[PDB]
Design an enzyme around this catalytic site. Structure first.
Site, short mmCIF file in Angstrom:
data_model
loop_
_atom_site.label_atom_id
_atom_site.label_comp_id
_atom_site.label_asym_id
_atom_site.label_seq_id
_atom_site.Cartn_x
_atom_site.Cartn_y
_atom_site.Cartn_z
N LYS C 112 3.57 -3.51 0.62
CA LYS C 112 2.39 -3.27 -0.20
C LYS C 112 1.21 -4.02 0.40
O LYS C 112 1.38 -4.89 1.25
CB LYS C 112 2.65 -3.69 -1.65
CG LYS C 112 1.63 -3.18 -2.66
CD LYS C 112 1.07 -1.82 -2.27
CE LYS C 112 2.10 -0.72 -2.43
NZ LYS C 112 1.46 0.62 -2.45
N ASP C 152 -3.29 4.45 -1.61
CA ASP C 152 -3.23 4.77 -3.03
C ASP C 152 -4.61 4.57 -3.66
O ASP C 152 -5.62 4.50 -2.94
CB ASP C 152 -2.13 3.93 -3.69
CG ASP C 152 -0.78 4.61 -3.64
OD1 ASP C 152 -0.61 5.66 -4.30
OD2 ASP C 152 0.12 4.11 -2.93
#
Lengths: 458, 458, 458, 458
Positions: C112, C152
């Site tokens: 991430k 994202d």
């Protein structure tokens, strides 16, 4: 499974025997596991070198790169060019290199490089082809912080220059990777001087420790026995301090003054005989020159040490084991009180391990210092270490600065060995502080300590 | 959404409040934006460890690398091992580390890493498993230029040694990443001394500036309050410069001499009760020693601060708020000519609101010179930077060399702080260079000056 | 002292509660020691993203990068530039990635990163400036084989291209790091596509698995509720296979044909509402369309699920828990037998934590399919993995080939989930292969199996 | 197919002509290959930059890196900003650089860096938007080992600092190797001071050798003629030694004191004239001062060396060939003892072809010793190498230490030139160590020697 490395087997045998002989190995049974970690060299790597000579052919040789001590600095090692270099002698020189290099104190990866590329009998183009095809494959396994092959006796500045030329043209990194460069392109001073200076520094250190500084190369007989470069530097230092050089065991024989206890060698004569030893001018005529025949009674068949006389300093370098069991007591009845060996393991182990009986009777100075050239020869690699600092500091030092660095380094070597032998090896009271056991004591102590602290052995 | 790091956000509040209220922003507006740029730590890295205890499990601790000044030095982050440190104290020590490494002057990448590796109840195998599982995920984000971890309480010796072990075993690069090494594997001298050293010098320099020489940590009664390692080093430098150590804030309390102005804390008891403080050998036993119990009047509740008398140096060591309650006027009336906050953010702002008047109303020494907890000697990180210089130069210096350098760091802190205080905080005529105000002053002035220069903040 | 991450700790609690209560917890004794390694921060990469906008000033956006494990493959972790994203929701994204990719089973795991960037229609030059700064601080921790981030919320194709641009201009490496590339610069045929493809594929596969093929998404009611890109893909494939789309959900409000049970949606209305949803103009004009609103009976606030109707294939993409116990038995009576979501489980726990009353008796075809978002929208990360294979192969595939591989990945995830659920939490001759317990079974099974085989933890 | 390199072709032609003209190439005919291997620069590299001004549009440019010394040290070069910078002047700067940089002795990869970045009309935002796109295409081709750009006029500290900021933010490696970075972080002292100090050192050694120690900058009539920084530094050091500066060759002209035989310039008054020089305010305001106009009769249209009087030292700086040729033997009647070419090949062939017989016939100081433009000073690059050593050793030196190293460097270059001229070149009996031919001698001698040692070619 385990192959045969005869010289390595000999070195390991001597280390284990002198260790278990020493009181430390008895009083510290945990050390019985240190050897396993250190006995294996940390990394030995070889390379298939495929290079064409000037006529135009194929030569598929193998280079050599050894790192044996990884508790002090990045993995180092001086090169040496001789077709006698192979795995066996590589690991032997490493197994003594660790207990020379950790004794040096400086942060230096113990080891030794080399090649079986003969120095003589190939034109310089052939040397360039070899070095280029060598650093085609040596570069990956080296680096200023990983591995820094150096150069010494047997490998000249030419081959190291060709090798680094390929390295720099390869990785585009003009950074210290080949220790022992030349003065123009980032070399060092005292670099050839290291071997001669270091040995005599070790000798004066131990002699002064014995006699509380009263006598150290102050006029005593110094059978330098290293006529060439090693004498050219050692006897220079000796006459700087004041000791009277008195002999040299040249490859032809043990060349001597009229008599050891009656005369002494001029360093000019040593330089002359060395030059004639390397030059094609007759070596035999060299021993029979006007001075060399009237002021000096050359005896190329008998050692000055069996002659007794008054010889103290000894270094059978040019002649590997000129002395033998023939002079069993006369060697030290000569008053030598010390023996180093300029060439690695110069005189064979018989004369080393003998006189252990008389060591009990003799005291300190009187106890001969047959501590081999190990703590003495550190100077060589020691200057290499200083050379590394230069390439780290990007700025060349001075001559006196490097000389002071060498002096402090030999201070460290002698003090570490002697003080470790004093307590760990149970130094013989009324005798030199376990000089022969000093190698075992210092090596095992340094190895176990730096292995526990650094997590090498646990 | 910033989750707020309580320690770090508290340190922020302190910084911002004693900053934007301070004069420098009122002068220079651009200052404002710079906060944001430094507000974010330059770089923080954190890694898991999948290791096992000697029994065999899946213990998972977590390591830390804080980096809160990417202008002067590369990223140097001191490690510290304690289950306490998670993220809050991490970024807090970082937000202090800006001004610490900026005031240091030396090119030191501000930061302070660590891990929550439990020191107690874990031995050789467990230490190795964790501190070899350290480098498996730490090596990549570190390495000289990129980042250089360090060591402290909990990380002392064994742990950093094992980190180096795995790092060097990993990337084949014997280098100076793990700052604060040990002698054999390229360590440094004065490194234990460090924090205890310098500060006295620091404090001396301070009052020296106050007294224009004259009183410079000489003769004056010193409430070192840190009899352990910190005083084992301080009290040494103390009596070297002349100061009279007179007290101690052990776990027992504010243990003190007959009168913290008449009798002096014998450094013998300093190190003895230091041994009794590191070990849980009852403090009472030492303080009940006949000679000790007589010469020293042990009143753990009573504090040299509230004791007043004529004690003329006071330092509330790690014991939080070791300064007494009545300190504000008591220790002032004692005229210590110096105050500090050795216990990080100890006495409340009202307790150090004393001497705010004295800066101008009193004078020089009489203006009892509070040294901000941040405004001290960088001895730890400073000696770590000297260790970095040593490792990069590939040649270790001597003890006196490292000491002289540490003196240079201290002097840099001194001058940076006060001179920038005079510059921006502009202590009115009489007022000693604003110290807490000027600590913040100097910190952010060097911050913004750099960040505009090198383009960190534009 | 973990600063509890609300979304992360909530999702972890749900997964752990479904794990430890299922029989799988006892089926293997090492299971109770896998969690303490599956979810723990092996690599949190904090840095600063200081950049400049038009009104020249430093914006110090906090951008960091979290990594958890690399067992199935590299950290194909989609970045986040969400307006108020923090370490909490970012580590939640990490964890959803580990279990999502573990079910997916190609080359992906837990990674991430990103900043709390605020798109808000910042000027495109501001986008370029922030992206360039972020990649300057990001490149080191990314790479085709180390880390290949995606984008994202807060990142669409433009920011992806800018980050790429700076990376390629940076390290001189036109590699495959930045996923979701563009057609000119190495994109994908099913990009930006899939998601809905994968969901509908999953649904038809479960229905066919239930009724031995036969009814496989042909002439059955479908409440896609995702008219945007989601249904632009889904309903396209729905009318390809044979299902009839019935409903629609919007952020302004969910919409319906004359009734859910009465009629079914046409792709034209879906596409029109989609275009208005992605256009700057709000979706209101599409729902307020006279021809749309009357025939397609538009009641945005009232959710068609509340009307229940007779739909089967329903997907609350935009309605994040717009329905609760109001329709609990009513949907089951309507024959929905499937619930998922286009987004990452936008529907709050409510009906999922519920439904148990039906679960006890609902079986197979009768049983709902609460396909967790993880087992519903694998399509996105599956297409990203195909993009990585495309960049590694250095060529470009066709739409049919990538679609076939998407089908294969869907089949793999579907069969893996069902097989793991039946293996450990065996359906008691009833509810379709433990659909709710299927996520727990698949997660624990894959985690423990790959962890043992890979030997990360022992 | 060598393209138009007018400045480079001119430099190469002059160098080859002076080489083959002297006995350097005549007594050693086998040297006539080094030019072929050294005519080509080692690794001249350029980077394409695409930046944006504050208003906003693309702007292509080009950077420039010259390196004409790959045997001494790693590629280097001081950044210079001018739209006049292009491949031609780049290769000229380097092909004249090699000689002086090899004379420097330090391990420096002689060369030059630069760009056509206009420094007039582009402020903070623009210069930052260039020096963050400066390293984007430059970092890969540089590094401490590979290539280490530096800075000089045009590239003041601002642009080089921004450039650093970018690459440090780029490669995550501080490793300060932009070599000219500000003194706040990794910067040196005497860095601006270097040029004039090196000028005075070289001229002082020249004069001292001419007089055999009698006179050297001890009241001799200097004409620094470098009114700005050049004079601010050089004349300061001149009056430190004792010489008296008499003329300033501004863009206004050869501004002069009343008489060049008796009345001198004061370096503070020189600084005032320099302040009037950098400011576009006409210097007529300065030279009309009551102190100025009366005590100093200013003749901007008359070279003071033409005035003769008793002028001895001078420097026709950037203003090309400001000195005349009519001054001829009246110059030696003034007893100059020295000739300068402070600019880049200022005077014409005959102006410095005089003194050709004064080298031998005018014995001693009477030899009007010409300073080659290359041999003038290594000050810039010398302090650049000192910056190298400081940054690699991670420890800033003192002003006195850097000045001492600078003095040693100037001594090395001076002695190298003189020695190589008196051995290789054809200096007649005491013929001013063949000053004119000394440049050619020294350069080709060092080039061939280090080429043979480094083994680049046969």
């Amino acid at each position: 499974n385990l192959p045969v490395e005869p010289e390595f087997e000999q070195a390991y045998k001597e280390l284990a025997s002198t260790l278990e002989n020493s009181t430390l190995f008895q009083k510290n049974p945990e050390y019985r596991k240190a050897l396993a970690v250190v006995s294996v060299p940390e990394r030995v790597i070889q390379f298939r070198v495929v290079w064409e000579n000037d006529k135009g052919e194929v030569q598929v040789n193998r280079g050599f790169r050894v790192q044996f001590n990884s508790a002090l600095g990045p993995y180092k090692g001086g090169l040496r060019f001789h077709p006698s270099v192979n795995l066996s002698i590589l690991k032997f020189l490493g197994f003594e290199q660790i207990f020379k290099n950790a004794l040096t104190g400086l942060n230096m990866g113990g080891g030794k490089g080399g090649s079986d590329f003969d120095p003589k009998g190939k034109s310089d183009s052939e040397i360039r082809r070899f070095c280029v095809a060598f650093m085609t494959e040596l570069c990956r396994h080296i680096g200023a912080d990983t591995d820094v092959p150096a150069g010494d006796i047997g490998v000249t500045g030419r081959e190291i220059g060709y090798l680094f030329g390929q390295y720099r043209k390869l990785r585009n990194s003009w950074e210290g990777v080949l220790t022992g460069k030349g003065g123009s392109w980032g070399g060092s001073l005292i670099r050839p001087e290291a071997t001669g200076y270091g040995v005599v520094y070790y000798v004066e250190h131990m002699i002064a420790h014995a006699t509380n500084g009263a006598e150290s190369f102050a006029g005593k007989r110094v059978a330098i026995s290293g006529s060439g470069n090693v004498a050219q530097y050692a006897a220079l230092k000796v006459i700087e301090l004041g000791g009277r050089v008195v002999s040299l065991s040249d490859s032809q024989g043990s060349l001597i003054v009229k008599d050891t206890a009656k005369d002494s060698f001029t360093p000019a004569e040593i330089d002359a005989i060395a030059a004639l030893k390397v030059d094609r001018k007759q070596i035999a005529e060299l021993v029979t020159d006007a001075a060399f025949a009237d002021k000096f009674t050359y005896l190329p068949g008998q050692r000055p040490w069996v002659h007794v006389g008054a010889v103290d300093v000894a270094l059978p370098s040019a002649t590997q084991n000129e002395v033998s069991g023939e002079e069993a007591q006369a060697l030290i009845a000569a008053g030598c009180k010390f023996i180093a060996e300029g060439s690695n393991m110069g005189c064979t182990q018989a004369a080393i391990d003998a006189f252990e009986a008389h060591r009990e009777a003799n005291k300190g100075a009187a106890a001969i210092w047959y501590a081999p050239g190990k703590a003495a020869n550190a100077g060589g690699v020691a200057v290499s270490g200083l050379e590394m600092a230069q390439n780290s500091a990007r700025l060349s030092w001075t001559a006196e600065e490097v000389d002071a660095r060498l002096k402090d380094i030999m201070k460290s070597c002698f003090q570490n060995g002697l003080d470790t032998a004093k307590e760990y090896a149970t130094p013989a009271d009324g005798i030199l502080p376990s000089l022969v056991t000093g190698s075992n004591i210092a090596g095992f102590t340094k190895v176990a300590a730096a292995m526990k602290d650094q997590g090498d052995w646990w």
